[PDB]
Design an enzyme around this catalytic site. Structure first.
Site, PDB file in Angstrom:
ATOM      1  N   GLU A  26     131.174 -34.930 -10.339  1.00 19.22           N
ATOM      2  CA  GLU A  26     129.743 -34.852 -10.052  1.00 19.22           C
ATOM      3  C   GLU A  26     129.349 -33.958  -8.858  1.00 19.22           C
ATOM      4  O   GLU A  26     129.825 -34.192  -7.734  1.00 19.22           O
ATOM      5  CB  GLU A  26     129.180 -36.265  -9.755  1.00 19.22           C
ATOM      6  CG  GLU A  26     127.662 -36.244  -9.468  1.00 19.22           C
ATOM      7  CD  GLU A  26     127.126 -37.438  -8.712  1.00 19.22           C
ATOM      8  OE1 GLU A  26     127.890 -38.193  -8.053  1.00 19.22           O
ATOM      9  OE2 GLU A  26     125.893 -37.582  -8.724  1.00 19.22           O
ATOM     10  N   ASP A  35     121.832 -35.747 -15.145  1.00 16.97           N
ATOM     11  CA  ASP A  35     121.392 -37.092 -15.472  1.00 16.97           C
ATOM     12  C   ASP A  35     119.885 -37.153 -15.745  1.00 16.97           C
ATOM     13  O   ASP A  35     119.455 -37.926 -16.569  1.00 16.97           O
ATOM     14  CB  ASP A  35     121.789 -38.048 -14.345  1.00 16.97           C
ATOM     15  CG  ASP A  35     121.233 -37.654 -12.990  1.00 16.97           C
ATOM     16  OD1 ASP A  35     120.845 -36.491 -12.772  1.00 16.97           O
ATOM     17  OD2 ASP A  35     121.190 -38.533 -12.101  1.00 16.97           O
ATOM     18  N   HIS A  36     119.089 -36.338 -15.057  1.00 20.41           N
ATOM     19  CA  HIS A  36     117.628 -36.288 -15.244  1.00 20.41           C
ATOM     20  C   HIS A  36     117.152 -34.953 -14.630  1.00 20.41           C
ATOM     21  O   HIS A  36     117.963 -34.229 -14.017  1.00 20.41           O
ATOM     22  CB  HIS A  36     116.931 -37.489 -14.541  1.00 20.41           C
ATOM     23  CG  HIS A  36     117.368 -37.676 -13.129  1.00 20.41           C
ATOM     24  ND1 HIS A  36     117.045 -36.800 -12.107  1.00 20.41           N
ATOM     25  CD2 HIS A  36     118.278 -38.522 -12.610  1.00 20.41           C
ATOM     26  CE1 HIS A  36     117.783 -37.118 -11.029  1.00 20.41           C
ATOM     27  NE2 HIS A  36     118.552 -38.153 -11.280  1.00 20.41           N
ATOM     28  N   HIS A  67     115.323 -33.926  -3.415  1.00 19.53           N
ATOM     29  CA  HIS A  67     114.429 -34.975  -2.895  1.00 19.53           C
ATOM     30  C   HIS A  67     113.960 -34.567  -1.519  1.00 19.53           C
ATOM     31  O   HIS A  67     112.825 -34.873  -1.133  1.00 19.53           O
ATOM     32  CB  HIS A  67     115.176 -36.308  -2.730  1.00 19.53           C
ATOM     33  CG  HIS A  67     115.352 -37.048  -4.004  1.00 19.53           C
ATOM     34  ND1 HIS A  67     114.303 -37.486  -4.783  1.00 19.53           N
ATOM     35  CD2 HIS A  67     116.480 -37.413  -4.655  1.00 19.53           C
ATOM     36  CE1 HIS A  67     114.797 -38.089  -5.859  1.00 19.53           C
ATOM     37  NE2 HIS A  67     116.113 -38.075  -5.834  1.00 19.53           N
ATOM     38  N   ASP A  80     120.643 -33.183  -6.350  1.00 17.47           N
ATOM     39  CA  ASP A  80     119.535 -34.139  -6.433  1.00 17.47           C
ATOM     40  C   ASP A  80     119.041 -34.529  -5.032  1.00 17.47           C
ATOM     41  O   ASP A  80     117.843 -34.491  -4.766  1.00 17.47           O
ATOM     42  CB  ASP A  80     119.990 -35.383  -7.221  1.00 17.47           C
ATOM     43  CG  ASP A  80     119.026 -36.545  -7.125  1.00 17.47           C
ATOM     44  OD1 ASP A  80     118.131 -36.679  -8.002  1.00 17.47           O
ATOM     45  OD2 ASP A  80     119.238 -37.393  -6.215  1.00 17.47           O
ATOM     46  N   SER A 100     119.143 -42.293 -11.292  1.00 16.49           N
ATOM     47  CA  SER A 100     120.551 -41.966 -11.535  1.00 16.49           C
ATOM     48  C   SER A 100     121.365 -43.097 -12.116  1.00 16.49           C
ATOM     49  O   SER A 100     122.320 -42.875 -12.877  1.00 16.49           O
ATOM     50  CB  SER A 100     121.304 -41.489 -10.242  1.00 16.49           C
ATOM     51  OG  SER A 100     120.495 -40.549  -9.492  1.00 16.49           O
ATOM     52  N   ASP A 159     123.743 -33.636 -10.538  1.00 14.62           N
ATOM     53  CA  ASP A 159     122.695 -34.669 -10.441  1.00 14.62           C
ATOM     54  C   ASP A 159     121.330 -34.000 -10.207  1.00 14.62           C
ATOM     55  O   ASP A 159     121.176 -33.298  -9.225  1.00 14.62           O
ATOM     56  CB  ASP A 159     123.021 -35.686  -9.323  1.00 14.62           C
ATOM     57  CG  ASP A 159     122.268 -37.046  -9.508  1.00 14.62           C
ATOM     58  OD1 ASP A 159     121.031 -37.016  -9.624  1.00 14.62           O
ATOM     59  OD2 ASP A 159     122.878 -38.142  -9.520  1.00 14.62           O
ATOM     60  N   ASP A 170     127.718 -44.596  -4.779  1.00 14.43           N
ATOM     61  CA  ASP A 170     126.444 -44.109  -5.309  1.00 14.43           C
ATOM     62  C   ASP A 170     126.390 -44.245  -6.849  1.00 14.43           C
ATOM     63  O   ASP A 170     127.417 -44.195  -7.537  1.00 14.43           O
ATOM     64  CB  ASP A 170     126.214 -42.666  -4.836  1.00 14.43           C
ATOM     65  CG  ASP A 170     124.758 -42.154  -5.087  1.00 14.43           C
ATOM     66  OD1 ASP A 170     123.752 -42.905  -5.010  1.00 14.43           O
ATOM     67  OD2 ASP A 170     124.625 -40.959  -5.383  1.00 14.43           O
ATOM     68  N   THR A 188     126.035 -42.447  -9.686  1.00 14.00           N
ATOM     69  CA  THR A 188     126.811 -41.664 -10.658  1.00 14.00           C
ATOM     70  C   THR A 188     128.299 -42.019 -10.821  1.00 14.00           C
ATOM     71  O   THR A 188     128.781 -42.150 -11.949  1.00 14.00           O
ATOM     72  CB  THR A 188     126.550 -40.181 -10.449  1.00 14.00           C
ATOM     73  OG1 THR A 188     125.143 -39.992 -10.219  1.00 14.00           O
ATOM     74  CG2 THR A 188     126.944 -39.365 -11.671  1.00 14.00           C
TER      75      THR A 188
END
Ligand SMILES: [Zn+2]
Ligand SMILES: [Zn+2]
Ligand SMILES: [Zn+2]
Ligand SMILES: [Zn+2]
Ligand SMILES: [Zn+2]
Ligand SMILES: [Zn+2]
Lengths: 446, 446
Positions: free
Chosen positions: A319, A366-367, A328, A324, A99, A48, A150, A152
């Site tokens: 995952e 995912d990004h 953050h 991710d 996500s 992620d 979550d 994902t």
């Protein structure tokens, strides 16, 4: 079909040809990597927020710049894919996805708005690759280091208008149309319990303590419901190891933490002028990670063992979730340690695929995210930190895109790599929704 | 060997399968892209600072998120490559390279320290791919939108310990050991004149006004020396178009600007909270770019026409130089316009290669950069700007890694794409120095 065995610098970095990662022409090897035979299984691994920047930073730190990730870098077919979301109101592109919209895209093949799970901009439901695989008789697994509610892992088994509708209470309040008591399909956890994948492993035991507001199991906690509907519940590594069979009659549900599973490495948060004002950091293993809590690589192995027994084949999503979350948080060590963790799971997946011969393995994100690798003497407006790498040099990481407490994810296209039958479909520029169609086709799902 | 004719979203973005870029299985098409036949020519296109983020931002703005760059995105074989430099003193990795060390790496095959051109950490010279091509009798071309003394085109023809040694004066002061009057090989401009590539086009006329401190041409300005040594000097589009022959006897030297050639689009500089405080921007064409100044696509075409006459074959490097410079300047419009500009040159190159059949075309960047695509409502510590894209939606760009006047480049691995004989060698993870070996081998240079 070969995996890249070694693409580390071949010699002395300072000498002519010493930094080369190749030892000869690759044409023949790529030809041998090309096959349109049907895949019997699919293992999808998601880092992620693991964009190209995150992969480079973790490699530099853990393996050295000239090093090589035995799992992550070993996939031979590579490309770049776009993951933009949609503005719910206008239907125009929203350049930076969250996500939830991105997980929905590869799992259903339709773009949607940020925050949505399994529904399009009109809030219509679309079947996921997991529901389709199950319908065809394949075994299915959903593995993650995050809470199972979550974005994902939830996008594979739930359809709600907002990713926040974890359980009964949040759902009544935020997803009225999905609230069981108002006639809807239910909260994320409820829909998860209905989807009945054969193997589901992750964190998020907390929400399972809520009680259903309606239906057959009204008044029972979601945990009771699971036991009642016949799920085998495990909560630690030993009991997980003891599982010998996982199927529709005895589906496995592993809840290993109340929230997100523990992070692999600890380190301090990046800080304003931290590369100038403070000393370089050396990450350290988290004492709380535990011998009691299975790692992502263990969960992956156990899931492959179980899903394996199905003659038809299987679909498994794995995952590496906290890459991710630590990104953050502007925490280099948490972020990199989670990338290393994912690499180990990619390695178990590749070993299996390598032997089996009919498994398509895909590794992607995912990004993209916030972290950037910058010059050591950089004087930046955001949070920075200097790290002592495996090369014995210092690397500086920067998070400069948010004045808030959370660094923003980003919209740049990023790496998608694959190995096995149908892997050719990730080469070149593709879209995240193409991944849904590649998997469906590879698996022959009609 | 096919180029990807169309990878734009196949339909309605909001509908199932509408955002897909693929229309069918790619396996056969990839097998057809694989060839180990010798390359007769090589065209290397470099977007300076054009990492994946830069490509994504330019695509969103100019072609829409579901759009497709007919040039840049049309290359079928793709991978990711590492470009870290070396710390001069220790020989350990320096994670973020500058344009000089990176250009040296793909042009000589040996890693070096930031600021160096054509020499290793010991300051020892190593032959460039252009010098080697020339020795083998191939025609050679070096094209750029920057000053010809700038790092990227300079690395092909000069060996100096510091990129700053533009001409005689800076060299005596900064590169004493290369200073002509101290017995060295000369300044960047002087070694450029000695290297005698058949076609050299770009900016940087300013430095050619300097006068040689020693040698045959002592007292003559570098312009005089060029005329004297037999170069054909052109300084505008019409005269460039009039050139019909370019070779060792009549090498072409086109100087179209004193410094860097003009940028294609103008727009304001990104600003603090600019996405919040100011209105969205629409870039505008630069009225000074001129019908008088050839574009990068025109310089490319002309160069291909002339280099083409050589029966042995040719090596051409083309640089979309101002992507990096506008990125440093935190100017979204300048940055994007320069990427669209490079796309046109890529297109010309691909058209030729497609017809010719023995041309390896490569499009990549020297290192990554600062710009990130973030959520529209982002409140960031750096410089931001909202832009009006071709989709009719707003995209926000952020530059948050420097408190100084210049945004820092970054060290993330980035896309490398190729087409033609030997292109398979850019697939998977490779290193920037592998590119040198790939080109030397594709061309059979022994
Ligand atoms: Zn995410
Ligand atoms: Zn996630
Ligand atoms: Zn996130
Ligand atoms: Zn550069
Ligand atoms: Zn340059
Ligand atoms: Zn630069």
């Amino acid at each position: 079909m070969p995996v890249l065995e070694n693409r580390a610098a071949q010699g002395d970095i300072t000498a002519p040809g010493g930094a080369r990662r190749l030892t000869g022409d690759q044409t023949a090897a790529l030809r041998d990597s090309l096959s349109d035979k049907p895949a019997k299984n699919i293992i999808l691994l998601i880092g992620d927020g693991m964009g190209d920047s995150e992969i480079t930073a973790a490699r530099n730190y853990a393996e050295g710049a000239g090093g090589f990730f035995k799992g992550i870098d070993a996939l031979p077919l590579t490309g770049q894919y776009t993951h933009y979301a949609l503005n719910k109101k206008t239907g125009k592109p929203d350049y930076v996805t969250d996500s939830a919209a991105s997980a929905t895209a590869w799992s259903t093949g339709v773009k949607t708005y940020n925050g949505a799970l399994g529904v399009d901009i009109h809030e219509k439901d679309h079947p996921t690759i997991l529901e389709m695989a199950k319908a065809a008789g394949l075994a299915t697994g959903n593995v993650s280091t995050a809470e199972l509610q979550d974005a994902t892992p939830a996008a594979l088994v739930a359809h709600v208008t907002s990713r926040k509708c974890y359980g009964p209470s949040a759902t009544s309040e935020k997803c009225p149309g999905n609230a069981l008591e108002k006639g809807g399909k239910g909260s994320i956890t409820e829909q998860l319990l209905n989807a009945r994948a054969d193997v589901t492993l992750g964190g998020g035991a907390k929400t399972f303590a809520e009680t259903a507001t309606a239906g057959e199991w009204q008044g029972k906690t979601l945990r009771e419901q699971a036991q009642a509907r016949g799920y085998q519940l495990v909560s630690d590594a030993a009991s997980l190891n003891s599982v010998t069979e996982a199927n529709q009659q005895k589906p496995l549900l592993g809840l290993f933490a109340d929230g997100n599973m523990p992070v692999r490495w600890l380190g301090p948060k990046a800080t304003y002028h931290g590369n100038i004002d403070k000393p370089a950091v050396t990450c350290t293993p988290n004492p709380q990670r535990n011998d009691s809590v299975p790692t992502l690589a263990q969960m992956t192995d156990k899931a492959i063992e179980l899903l394996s027994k199905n003659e038809k084949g299987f679909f498994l999503q794995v995952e590496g979730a906290s890459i991710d979350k630590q990104d953050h948080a502007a925490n280099p060590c948490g972020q990199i340690g989670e990338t290393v963790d994912l690499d180990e799971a990619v390695q178990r997946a590749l070993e299996f695929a390598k032997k089996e011969g009919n498994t398509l393995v895909i590794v992607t994100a995912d990004h993209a995210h916030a972290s950037q690798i910058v010059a050591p003497d950089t004087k930046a407006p955001g949070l920075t930190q200097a790290l002592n790498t495996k090369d014995g040099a210092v690397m500086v990481m920067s998070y400069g895109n948010s004045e808030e407490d959370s660094q923003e994810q980003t919209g740049s296209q990023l790496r998608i790599a694959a190995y096995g039958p149908h892997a050719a479909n990730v080469v070149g520029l593709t879209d995240q929704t193409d991944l849904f169609y590649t998997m469906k086709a590879a698996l022959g799902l009609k």
